[PDB]
Amino acid sequence: LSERNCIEIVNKLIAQKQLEVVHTLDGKEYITPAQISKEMRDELHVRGGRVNIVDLQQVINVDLIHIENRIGDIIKSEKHVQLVLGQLIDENYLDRLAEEVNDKLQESGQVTISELCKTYDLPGNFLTQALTQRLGRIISGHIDLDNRGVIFTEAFVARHKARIRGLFSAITRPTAVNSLISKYGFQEQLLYSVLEELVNSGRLRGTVVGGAVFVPDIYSRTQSTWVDSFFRQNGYLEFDALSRLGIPDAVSYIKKRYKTTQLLFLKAACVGQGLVDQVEASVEEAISSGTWVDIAPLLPTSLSVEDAAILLQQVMRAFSKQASTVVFSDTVVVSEKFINDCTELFRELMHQKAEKEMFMFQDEIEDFLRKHIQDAPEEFISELAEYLIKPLNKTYLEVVRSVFMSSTTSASGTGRKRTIKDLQEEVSNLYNNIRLFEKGMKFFADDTQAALTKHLLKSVCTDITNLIFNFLASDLMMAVDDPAAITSEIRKKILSKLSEETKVALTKLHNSLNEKSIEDFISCLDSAAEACDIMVKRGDKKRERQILFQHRQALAEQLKVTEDPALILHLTSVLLFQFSTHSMLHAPGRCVPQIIAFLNSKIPEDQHALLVKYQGLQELSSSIKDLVLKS
Amino acid sequence: KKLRKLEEKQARKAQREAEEAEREERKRLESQREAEWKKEEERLRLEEEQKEEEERKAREEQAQREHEEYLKLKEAFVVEEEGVGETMTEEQSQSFLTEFINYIKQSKVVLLEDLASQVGLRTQDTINRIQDLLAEGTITGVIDDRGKFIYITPEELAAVANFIRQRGRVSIAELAQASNSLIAW
Amino acid sequence: QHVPIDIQTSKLLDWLVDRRHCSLKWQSLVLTIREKINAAIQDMPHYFHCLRILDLLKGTEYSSQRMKDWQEIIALYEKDNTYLVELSSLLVRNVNYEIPSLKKQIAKCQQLQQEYSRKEEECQAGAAEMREQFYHSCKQYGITGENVRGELLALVKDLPSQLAEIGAAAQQSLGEAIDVYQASVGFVCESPTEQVLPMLRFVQKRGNSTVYEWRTDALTLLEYTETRNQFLDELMELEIFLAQRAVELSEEADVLSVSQFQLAPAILQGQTKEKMVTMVSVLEDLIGKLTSLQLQHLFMILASPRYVDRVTEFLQQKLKQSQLLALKKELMVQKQQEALEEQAALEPKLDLLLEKTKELQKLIEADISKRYSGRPVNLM
Amino acid sequence: SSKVSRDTLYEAVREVLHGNQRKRRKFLETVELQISLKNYDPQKDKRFSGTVRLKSTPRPKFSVCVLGDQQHCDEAKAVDIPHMDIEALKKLNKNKKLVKKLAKKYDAFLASESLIKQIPRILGPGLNKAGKFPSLLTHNENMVAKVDEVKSTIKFQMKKVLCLAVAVGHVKMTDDELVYNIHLAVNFLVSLLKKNWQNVRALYIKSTMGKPQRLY
Amino acid sequence: SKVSFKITLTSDPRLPYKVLSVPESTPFTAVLKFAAEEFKVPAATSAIITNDGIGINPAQTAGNVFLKHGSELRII
C-alpha cells in the first residue's frame, strides 16, 4: 500500500469516529491523545520534575491546544503535579529546591524569597507556600513570611542580636527606631524581642517612648539632674532653657516630675515657693507701713514683665479685705495710706496758693513728687501724678470753697442772712416802678413809643437785672460792690459759670434787653426771679397809689429845688402829664419837646407857651416852677 | 375717388389671388405627373424583379436537375451489418453492478485494465462507476495512484484503527508497513 | 492532407477503439500471447521486437518452432491490429501513470535531503551554543573547564593560606577598637563587670588558630563554621558600634552632650568623626575580605560535600547535553549523505524511461502514418 | 566635646598654676574666668541669670553668716560659724549705713524659715540692694553641709556690659580639679546664652596677680 | 481502402444501429441518402449528429468524417 491513500484511510476513520488521533506538525506521524500524556509524563520525569508546555510542543511535535488539554488532565491524574505560569512542577523538583535552599541557608545565614524567585523564575506566592509546607521537615530554619518572606537559621538570630547590642551600646541621644530598622536592615519583631531581653538583663539601659524613639538612661539622667539642680539652686525654671535641653513641652515635664512640690506657672516660667513668700512679705510690709514696694528687684532678672504681673496678681489675691491698695506700672504696689499722705502733703501748699488767688500742670506734680519722693522709676512718677490729678483737684476745689466761706462767713454770711431781705425789697421797688412806664409806653404814639421804650430798656431794666446778676455772682464772688458795675461782658462771664436750669431763664432775661418790647421782658424777668428765689410782689392798688404819690412828691421837690433849666422844664412837663393823666412817666432828654407838644391838649395856653419858649433855647423860668406849686 | 380706391384695391386683390391659384394648380398637376412617372418606374422594377424570379426558378430547377442526375453515380454501396439497441434496464443495471461487486470482492485487487475488460467498459467509464459507488459508499477501498483499486472491509478498517489506538505513535511509513501486514491482497 | 493527425495522449486508446481497428477483449488475447512468449523466451535465436526477431530467425533458423511461434503470434497481432492496441496501451499507461510516479519519488528524495540538511545545521548551531554556555558557567565558578571535581578540590585545597593573612590583619588594628567599645559599654551601659567581644580579644594577641586552644575540629579558628560565625558576628557588632558613633559625632556637641562625657575615662573623651571613620573603614575592609572569600564558595566546598556534588552534576549535565547533541547532528549528517547517495543511484531510471517512451512514441506515430498514408501524426 | 579642648584647658591651667615667669606671693591666689560676649544688646535682649555649684571650693575665705533663731544659734555656737540673733538685727534701726556694712562684711547669708519671712520688717530693703538675700535653712538639714554648699556656688548675671568674670579656684589645686571647675562653669554659661557659641567672643583664665591665658 | 459509418437512429425505441462500407473519398450525401432510405425517413429535416450531439457538415468526403468526429454516429 502507499502513503497518500493510507492518509486517506485515516481521515475516513476519523470521520467515522472509529479512531481519535492528532496530526504531527511535521505531518509524517500520528499520535493518539492517550500517548501525548505518556510523552508528557515521561519528559516531566526525565528533565527533573519541571517542564514547559512550549518545550512539550517542541518535543512531542503537536500543536499547543492538545498539550493544553492534557496538562489539565495530568494535574488530576497525578496529584503531585501543578501548573504555574504554564509549567508542570513536580514535588520531587520542589524537594530538590528545598535541599538547595537548605544548603544556601546554612551557608549565608539567610535567604530572600525575591532572590529565590529571580534565580528560579517561579512566582513568589508559589515558592512561599512550597517552602513553608516543608519548612522544618527538610529546611532547618524559621519563616518570616511578612518582610520579604526571608527565611533564616539559628545563626542569623545570633548575628541580629549581636548587631543590635552593638548599635544600641552607642546611642546616647533619643533616636528613632524606624530609621534604624530601615537603614541597617533589621526585623521589627526580632529587634524588639532582643531589645526587651537586653534591657531586662541590664546590658542596655533605656526605654522606648511611644510604644518610636529610644531614650537611653544616660540622657534622661543628665536631663533630670540638670533641671533638678537648677530648680534647687535658683528656685524657678524658664521654659526656654528647658527647650534647649530637649524638652519641648515644659509645662508637662515639670508637672510629671515636680508634683508633690508647690509651684506657680507663669507663661514662660515656673516660680517655686520661696519667691512668692518673699514677694508676699514685702507687700505685707508695704501694706502695714503705709508705704510702697517694687517687686521687680525681688525676682530673677530673666522674668518678663508679664510673668511678674501674673505673679503679683496671684500674691495680691491674699489681700481682699485689707487696704484697697493699687498697682502702678504692673509691679509697684502703693498702699492707700500713702496716697492719702501725698494728698495731704500737697494740701498745705494748695491752700496757701488758693488763699493767694482768692490745678497746676502734671509736670509740676511730678516735680513735687521728685522733690519729696526718692529712688523711684520714672513710670511710677508719671502714673502717680496721673492718678493724683483728679483727687488733688477735688481737694483744691474744696479748699477754695472753704477759704471763700471763711473769708465770707461774715460777708456772704450777711449776704445770705441779712442782705437778701434788702435785695427783695429793692427789686420790689424797681419792679413796681417799671409798671407805670409800661403804662407810659402804651399811651404815647408809635415813634414816641419807640423812643420811650428804648430809653426805659436802657435805663431801668438793666437797673434790675444787675441786681440779680450781682446776687448770682455772689456765689462765684467775682461780683462788684457796686450793682451799677455790671456790664454785658460781665453778664456773659457770669452766665459762663451758671447752672443750666437757671442759665436758660437768665438768658431769656438778658437777651430780652435786645428786644423791642417790654412785656416779654416782664415775663422773662419774673421767670428769672423765681428761677433764683426772688419773691416779686406786684404792689396792689394801695402800693400803686403810694408809688404814684411818692413820684409826684419827689418830682415837685426836685424841680422846686434843682437849678438845671432843661431838667426843670423836663420835670415840669412830665409832672403836668402825670397830674392830668394819673400815671407815671420816664422819658429821655431826647424827647422832652414831644410831651410838651402833646400836653397842650390838657393845660392852659399860657403855661404851654412858657414851656415851649423855655425849651426853644431867668425871670421867665422862675415862672415855670411856680406853675407846679400853683397847679 | 374713394369708391375708386376701393375698386382698385379689389382688382389688386384679384391679382393677389389668381396667381396663387394657378401656382397651386401647377404644383399639384406636375407633382402628380412625377409621382405617376415614379409609379411607372416601379412597374418597370416589378418587371425586372419578375425576370429575376423566373430566371431564379430556372436556376433552382437547374440545381434540381443537377442533383437528380447527381445521384446516379451513387448507389453502389454495401451494408456490412445491422444492429439494434436492446436493453439497459435498471433491473439489468442492478444485476450488472451486483456481478461487478461479487467479482471485485473475489478478486479484491484490480488494475482497471482487467477490470475494464471483464466489466467491459472503457476505463474512464469504470472509474466513474467506481468513484460514484465509493462516494455514496457501498464498498470502501483504496484507488492507487499508480493505477489500481483494492477493497477494504470494515473489519480490516477496525483492525487498522486498533493498530493506531494501540501502538501510540506511528509514522506514515510505519503505517504503510502495517498495512502491507494486515490488509490482505 | 497536411491537416496533422493530432490527439491528446491519454485518449489514444479511446480514439483507436472508436476507430474500430481494435476492440475490447484484446486483453485475454495478449495474456495468451504472453503465455506463448514464455516459450519464445525459453528458446531464443513485442510486435516491433517481433519484426527484429523475424529478421534474426530468418537467418539463425519452419522445421523449428523458434520462429513459427512468432509467425502465429504476429498473425494474431495483426488480427484486428491487436499489436496496435497493445502498444498503444503500453505507451499510454507508461506515460500517464509512471512518469508522475518516478518524478514524484525523486522530488520527495530531494525534499528529504533539504530537510535533513537544515536539521543538521540547526543541531550544530545548538551544540555550539551549549558549549559556549557551559564555558560561561565554569568561568562564573572560576574553573578552567577540565575535570570539574578535580578543579573544585584543588580550589578548596588552597584555602588555608589567605585566612592566615586575615588573622594577621586582625591581630593588629583592633587594639583601639576593642578598648573603646569596652570602655563605652562599661560607661554608657553601666555594665563594667563583663568582657565584650571575647573571640576578638583572643585574636588580638593570642593567635588565629588552634580551635583546641579556644576550647581549652582541629582546624584554624575560621575553618570551623560556628567559631567563624561568631567571629564575623563580633566584627559586625564592633563595626556597627563605630559607625553609629560616627553618625552621632557628626552633629555639633550641645550642653547635654558635654555634660555626659565629663566623668568619662580619657579614651572615650576627645574622639572625632575622622578617628571613628578610620576604624570603621578598617573593620569594613576586613569584613569585606571575609565575605568576599565566602562569596567564592571556598567554605562550602570544605564542608557539606553535597554542594560540590551538585555543582559537578550541573556542569557535567551541560557538557553531556552538548556532546549528545553533537552525536545526533553527526548521525543526521550520515543519514542525509546516505539518502542523497540513494537518490543519485535511483536518478538514472527517469531518463531511461523517458527515452524509451519517446522511442515508442515515434514508433506509434510512424505506424499510424504508415497505415494512414504516411500522414503527420503526434500526441499531446 | 566643646570648642575648648582638654589639651588647651590643661595647657592654660599648667601656665597659670606652675610655669616659668610666675611670681610667688604671700597670699593664696584665686584663679578667675573672664568672658567677653558678642551679638548681645542688653537694652533689648533677655538678661540671663543663674547659679551653679562647682565641685571644689573656689574661695576658701568665703564668709557665711547664719541669721538664725534660738535653736540654730545654739547649733551654730557648737561651730565657728558666725551668727546673729533676732535681737541683734532689731538693734539696728533699719539704718541704711549699718545694713550696708553688715552686707559688706559677709559674702553669703543663711536664715531660718521663722526669720526669712521677717527680713523686710526688721532689716528693710538693704540686703536685696546689695545682692545678698539669705537662703533658707531647715532644721532637717546639716549646717556644715549647707554652709559648704553655699561656699561652692558661682553666679552668672548680666547687668549692662558684655564683660563677665567669676572665680573658679585657687593656686593650691591639683590641676585636675581646676580643669573640672572651668569645664563646669563654661558649659553652664553657654547653656545660659540664646545662641550657644555665637554669643561668646573670648575666654581667659587668670590668677589674681598673674599673666592672662586665652582659651577661646 | 474502405470505411464504414456507425448509423444508429434515435427516434426508434429499439435503436437500430447500421453499418455499411464505402471508400473514404465519397461525399457524405451518399451516406445520408442511403441511411434515410434504409430508415425510411425524410432526409431534409435530417441533421446527422454523432453520439455527443454536434452537427457535422454533410458536403464532405468520408475520410474527413471518419477522422474528425469518429465512426460512432447517429441520426435524429
Numbering used by the authors:
A (entry chain B): 27 to 237, 242 to 388, 476 to 734, 773 to 786
B (entry chain D): 120 to 304
C (entry chain C): 5 to 49, 64 to 79, 89 to 243, 339 to 502
D (entry chain A): 2 to 217
E (entry chain E): 2 to 77
Sentences from the paper on this structure:
Stalled ribosomes at the endoplasmic reticulum (ER) are covalently modified with the ubiquitin-like protein UFM1 on the 60S ribosomal subunit protein RPL26 (also known as uL24). In a pathway analogous to ubiquitin and other UBLs, post-translational attachment of UFM1 to the lysine residues of target proteins, UFMylation, is catalysed by an enzymatic cascade of E1 (UBA5), E2 (UFC1) and E3 (UFL1) enzymes. Collectively, we identify a fundamental role for UREL in dissociating 60S subunits from the SEC61 translocon and the basis for UFMylation in regulating protein homeostasis at the ER.
UREL forms a clamp-like C-shaped architecture that wraps around the 60S subunit contacting the ‘A site’ at one end and a site close to the peptide exit channel at the other end. CDK5RAP3 forms the central part of the C-clamp, acting as a bridge that contacts both UFL1 and UFBP1. CDK5RAP3 anchors UREL onto the ribosome through a module that interacts with RPL10a, which we have termed the RPL10a-binding domain (RBD). UREL binding to RPL10a buries a surface area of around 1,075 Å2, with binding predominately mediated by UFL1 WH4 and WH5, as well as CDK5RAP3. Hydrophobic contacts between UFL1 WH4 residues Trp256, Phe260, Tyr266 and Leu275, CDK5RAP3 residues Val377, Leu378 and Val380, and RPL10a Phe189 are the main interactions at this interface. A ten-residue segment (UFBP1(196–205)) connecting the WH1′ and N-terminal domains of UFBP1 binds to UFM1. UREL wraps around the ribosome in such a way that the catalytic module, located at the intersection of UFL1, UFBP1 and CDK5RAP3, orients the C-terminal Gly83 of UFM1 towards the stretch of RPL26 that contains Lys134, the major site of UFMylation.
